[PDB]
Write a protein that binds this ligand. Structure first.
Ligand code: BCL
Ligand code: BCL
Ligand code: BCL
Ligand SMILES: COC(C)(C)C/C=C/C(C)=C\C=C/C(C=O)=C/C=C/C(C)=C/C=C/C=C(C)/C=C/C=C(C)/C=C/C1=C(C)C[C@@H](O)CC1(C)C
Ligand SMILES: COC(C)(C)C/C=C/C(C)=C\C=C/C(C=O)=C/C=C/C(C)=C/C=C/C=C(C)/C=C/C=C(C)/C=C/C1=C(C)C[C@@H](O)CC1(C)C
Ligand SMILES: COC(C)(C)C/C=C/C(C)=C\C=C/C(C=O)=C/C=C/C(C)=C/C=C/C=C(C)/C=C/C=C(C)/C=C/C1=C(C)C[C@@H](O)CC1(C)C
Ligand SMILES: COC(C)(C)C/C=C/C(C)=C\C=C/C(C=O)=C/C=C/C(C)=C/C=C/C=C(C)/C=C/C=C(C)/C=C/C1=C(C)C[C@@H](O)CC1(C)C
Ligand SMILES: COC(C)(C)C/C=C/C(C)=C\C=C/C(C=O)=C/C=C/C(C)=C/C=C/C=C(C)/C=C/C=C(C)/C=C/C1=C(C)C[C@@H](O)CC1(C)C
Ligand SMILES: COC(C)(C)C/C=C/C(C)=C\C=C/C(C=O)=C/C=C/C(C)=C/C=C/C=C(C)/C=C/C=C(C)/C=C/C1=C(C)C[C@@H](O)CC1(C)C
Ligand SMILES: COC(C)(C)C/C=C/C(C)=C\C=C/C(C=O)=C/C=C/C(C)=C/C=C/C=C(C)/C=C/C=C(C)/C=C/C1=C(C)C[C@@H](O)CC1(C)C
Ligand SMILES: COC(C)(C)C/C=C/C(C)=C\C=C/C(C=O)=C/C=C/C(C)=C/C=C/C=C(C)/C=C/C=C(C)/C=C/C1=C(C)C[C@@H](O)CC1(C)C
Ligand SMILES: COC(C)(C)C/C=C/C(C)=C\C=C/C(C=O)=C/C=C/C(C)=C/C=C/C=C(C)/C=C/C=C(C)/C=C/C1=C(C)C[C@@H](O)CC1(C)C
Lengths: 48, 47, 48, 48, 48, 47, 47, 48, 47, 47, 48, 47, 48, 48, 48, 47, 47, 47
């Protein structure tokens, strides 16, 4: 029951870039959601 | 031990990639835990 | 019936990344819909 | 008549992922349309 | 004249998925246009 | 006859695909006519 | 029979795929009917 | 001058799907422009 | 004649595709003219 | 058995992939059930 | 200088469909810009 | 002459493709000039 | 230094269509920016 | 535990351009977020 | 160290068009940001 | 000389393409200068 | 050693690419630290 | 030396491409510096 055997059926050259892209987009989405839906993080950017 | 699969890799190589992904995931988790602790301390969140 | 035979006609290298993308996008869509259509989860982000 | 013969002319590896994408996007579109155009399902999310 | 001969010059694997995509998107576009530009179908969703 | 075209199909196969598309189009048209009659009856459209 | 088509499949394989899609569509329809009954009972729609 | 010779240099499998997509999108664009920029066709949809 | 071009087609086939496109465009134009006459009659356009 | 399909896989490999997807789906379902219980407890959703 | 030698280095199957796509998109863009930025052609659709 | 370039075409073929593009552009220009004259006459533009 | 040698390393079939797309999009972007950010060119369209 | 071995399974020609695109888009996203969510950097552009 | 060896592993035909696209889009992004976030450059377009 | 590079072209062909781009850029620049002079004359820009 | 992997590279080449990425990352980090110090000095951020 | 890498290029060719990009970046930098000086003089920026 070794999930790594998925790499025997899905080539890493196809899936690994996809998951890297998804990780980047997900982190950017968390940051954007917090930026939009809060007053801080937007006042921290503003400073004083 | 010697079979080549349609992707062109063997079982050992596929398990090495899996272990690598798991190790990088643990490092990422550690950094994320540190970042979340800092966010809890500084940001006005969860309190 | 045996649905695993779908992999005898559709290569896993083509379909599995697609459904992984579907999982990611669907989870992001649920989270975004709840974020937009509720006052909490956006006040939980705000805190106090 | 036998519509399965379409798989003799359209490779399943090309058409089946496309129809899976269509099914996913159509379900998401129905859910999003009901979410946007109703007061409930958006108050069910809100709760009390 | 025999329009089926187009399949002798355009491969069905390229054109048939495209026309299926067109059919799906056109039906969704009709439904979305009626949803946006009418008061009913949006009150039928709302119910009472 | 028996000629293979740049798409890899013969004329009989191409005509079979055409007849299939036409038959499916007729079934789709019948269902769409039923749906339009139901819409006319139930919706305020055309009234 | 035993004829290989441009997609690389025979008639039996193509018909098996069709039967598979039809079989899965019925389970999808059953789950959808259950979901629509639950929606009618719980949601204000059709009321 | 024979414009059919455009198919001796551009493969029909590449261009014909493109022009079909263009035709579909152009018809949808005309319909959408009429829908957006008129009061009728949007009152014909709603009826009475 | 009998000359195969980089697309894999001969001049006769290319001219056949052209004639087919012209015939289809003429049918499309006829239907479009009928639709435009109907639009002129029924819609406030051009009035 | 021992038959190679157009994708390049045998029945055993295709069934192994299916079993893996089902096992990962059950783990995902367990985590999702835990997350939904936590959401029900901690959020105003469902009273 | 014979600008027709551009097809000895750029295959027509790549450039001609592309230039047709720009022709269509540019015509649609001119029409859309005039439609949006004027009162007529939007009162011509409406009629009376 | 008779020299095949990386696109698979000879110089004469590319030149006659260019001549065809020029002829089509001239026809398009004629129709566009007619359309612009009609627009100037009918639309409130350049007035 | 000869900048044509880039064509010894970048295929003209790949780069020339891309730069043609860039030229078209840049011209359309200049026209659109002037259209949006001015009162004339939008009154020239309107006329009188 | 050498992370260079990721290049023995994922082609650098596929992953390196993707990560360069990610770097560019992330820098542009940081700049755009700060531009949108602050009064300065938008007053620094304005000058006096 | 010699960064030119990046072309021994990444094909210039893949990376050079991508970086040209990045350069074009970045310049257009700077111009658009200054256009949107300033009163001048938009009054320079307007003239008098 | 006579060397074929990974794109399939020799230095003479690559320099021909460069000279062509440079030659077309000058005609584009001339038309752009004419258009900018006309814009300066006819539009409120730069006045 | 002297073993070609599915990507067509050896271990030494893959490790050289890794060291290159790490060296470029350090240069980028230095420039970014300088830029962040300048931002802290000039911008109203963190003050 | 005299080694073909997976991209099909030698070290000398790869370094020539790098030198080309670096040489072009300096002309781009000079034009950008001139444009920024003109912007500083003519625009309200940095004033
Ligand atoms: C607008 C006012 C009316 C209305 C009147 C009209 C009229 C009039 C018509 C329709 C038509 C349709 N309407 Mg309607 N319709 C209304 C509201 C709805 C609503 C809703 C949310 O209330 C639903 C869901 C529908 C649904 C539909 C469909 C039954 C049909 C779309 C035809 C089509 O082109 O499908 C395109 C297909 C899709 C969009 C999805 C494609 C699905 C594919 C096949 C999925 C395949 C799955 C695959 C096998 C899975 C593979 C998995 C892997 C192997 C693992 N309508 C209302 C209230 N509607 C038309 C019709 O009956 O045509 C037949 C029609 O004539
Ligand atoms: C609209 C008013 C109602 C409602 C009434 C309706 C009605 C009526 C129906 C649904 C239907 C559905 N609704 Mg609903 N529904 C509501 C609110 C929700 C909400 C929510 C946030 O509240 C959820 C999440 C759902 C969820 C669902 C699903 C159970 C189902 C979608 C079918 C479909 O086509 O899926 C498409 C699939 C996706 C979108 C995701 C696909 C997932 C894929 C398979 C992931 C594969 C993973 C892969 C193996 C991973 C690989 C990884 C690698 C190997 C590493 N609904 C409300 C309150 N809903 C329908 C149904 O039951 O049909 C079966 C249905 O008939
Ligand atoms: C936000 C408040 C601050 C500010 C503080 C920050 C901080 C803090 C940092 C930056 C960073 C950067 N900022 Mg800033 N920055 C500000 C405003 C600006 C403005 C502006 C219009 O005012 C400019 C243009 C910049 C520019 C930059 C860059 C110097 C740098 C981006 C790094 C990066 O990831 O690039 C990604 C690359 C791109 C976006 C474009 C890529 C270009 C490629 C290489 C083009 C190649 C061309 C190719 C060779 C052509 C081929 C042609 C064919 C061969 C024919 N900033 C303001 C006022 N900025 C960061 C930095 O210094 O990192 C090094 C950094 O740490
Ligand atoms: C939408 O609404 C909001 C608010 C955003 C909320 C929604 C959020 C949602 C839905 C989800 C959020 C987040 C999420 C989920 O879910 C995140 C998961 C992150 C994960 C799993 C990160 C993992 C990282 C792993 C990495 C970087 C691994 C790298 C390994 C590498 C490069 C190499 C390793 C190696 C290899 C190969 C060979 C070995 O010999 C040597 C070794 C070196 C070991
Ligand atoms: C934009 O503004 C709005 C408001 C939307 C208005 C605009 C609307 C516009 C512009 C257009 C609207 C709609 C439109 C137009 O125009 C619709 C046309 C629909 C059509 C033609 C549908 C046709 C469907 C045909 C199907 C499904 C056929 C399938 C056949 C299959 C799969 C197989 C058949 C078979 C084959 C191969 C082999 C044989 O051995 C056996 C057999 C089984 C026979
Ligand atoms: C736009 O406005 C809104 C409001 C959204 C309204 C608009 C809505 C519109 C236009 C449309 C809505 C919906 C719609 C319109 O058709 C839905 C249709 C859904 C359908 C047909 C679903 C079908 C699913 C079928 C599935 C999952 C089948 C899977 C089968 C599989 C994977 C395998 C089976 C098998 C195979 C291969 C091999 C065999 O050996 C063994 C076996 C295991 C058997
Ligand atoms: C943007 O602002 C708005 C308001 C939208 C205004 C803007 C609108 C603009 C800019 C443009 C609008 C419209 C436009 C322009 O310009 C339309 C043109 C439509 C045309 C040319 C349609 C043509 C259709 C032709 C078809 C379907 C032909 C099909 C033929 C087929 C499939 C086969 C034929 C055959 C072949 C091969 C083989 C033979 O053996 C047998 C035969 C059977 C013969
Ligand atoms: C749009 O409006 C909103 C509000 C969003 C509502 C709409 C929501 C909608 C429509 C849908 C929502 C959700 C949904 C649906 O429907 C979700 C479904 C999730 C599913 C099915 C998840 C499944 C996950 C499965 C996984 C991760 C499996 C992994 C297995 C792996 C990696 C490998 C296993 C293995 C394999 C292969 C090879 C063997 O050698 C070894 C072995 C280890 C065995
Ligand atoms: C926002 O800003 C707005 C408002 C949009 C304003 C901005 C607008 C801008 C920037 C630009 C606008 C427009 C523009 C520019 O610039 C237009 C140019 C149009 C042109 C050049 C059209 C040309 C068409 C040519 C055609 C269709 C030729 C076809 C020829 C064919 C298919 C075949 C011919 C032949 C061949 C091969 C073989 C021979 O044997 C026989 C022969 C038959 C001869
Ligand atoms: C939001 O910000 C806004 C407002 C948009 C402002 C921002 C604008 C910005 C940032 C930039 C604007 C514009 C810009 C920059 O920068 C423009 C540059 C234009 C250029 C360089 C155009 C060049 C055209 C060249 C052409 C058409 C050449 C064609 C040559 C051809 C087809 C063939 C020639 C030949 C060849 C090959 C083979 C030989 O055998 C024979 C021969 C005949 C010799
Ligand atoms: C969304 O909300 C906002 C506000 C945006 C906040 C969110 C921000 C988020 C989520 C993330 C932000 C940023 C981030 C993360 O996370 C950034 C990381 C940047 C990094 C790691 C940059 C690294 C750059 C490295 C470079 C350029 C390396 C190049 C090396 C090259 C080309 C070549 C080197 C060489 C090689 C190969 C061969 C050797 O022989 C010789 C040698 C020359 C050595
Ligand atoms: C988002 O918010 C805003 C406000 C936009 C702010 C954000 C801005 C940000 C994040 C970034 C901005 C800008 C930026 C960064 O960062 C710019 C960098 C530009 C650069 C590096 C340009 C470089 C250009 C180089 C060129 C054109 C080189 C070309 C060389 C060529 C074609 C050929 C040369 C040659 C070769 C091959 C062969 C030899 O034999 C002969 C030779 C002829 C030598």
């Amino acid at each position: 029951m070794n999930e790594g055997r998925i790499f025997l059926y899905v080539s890493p050259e196809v899936i690994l870039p996809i998951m890297f892209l998804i990780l980047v987009l997900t982190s950017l989405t968390v940051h954007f959601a917090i930026l939009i839906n809060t007053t801080w993080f937007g006042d921290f950017f503003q400073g004083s | 031990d010697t079979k080549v699969y349609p992707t062109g890799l063997t079982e050992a190589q596929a398990l090495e990639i899996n272990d690598g992904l798991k190790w990088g995931t643990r490092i990422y988790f550690g950094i994320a835990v540190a970042a979340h602790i800092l966010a809890f301390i500084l940001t006005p969140w969860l309190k």
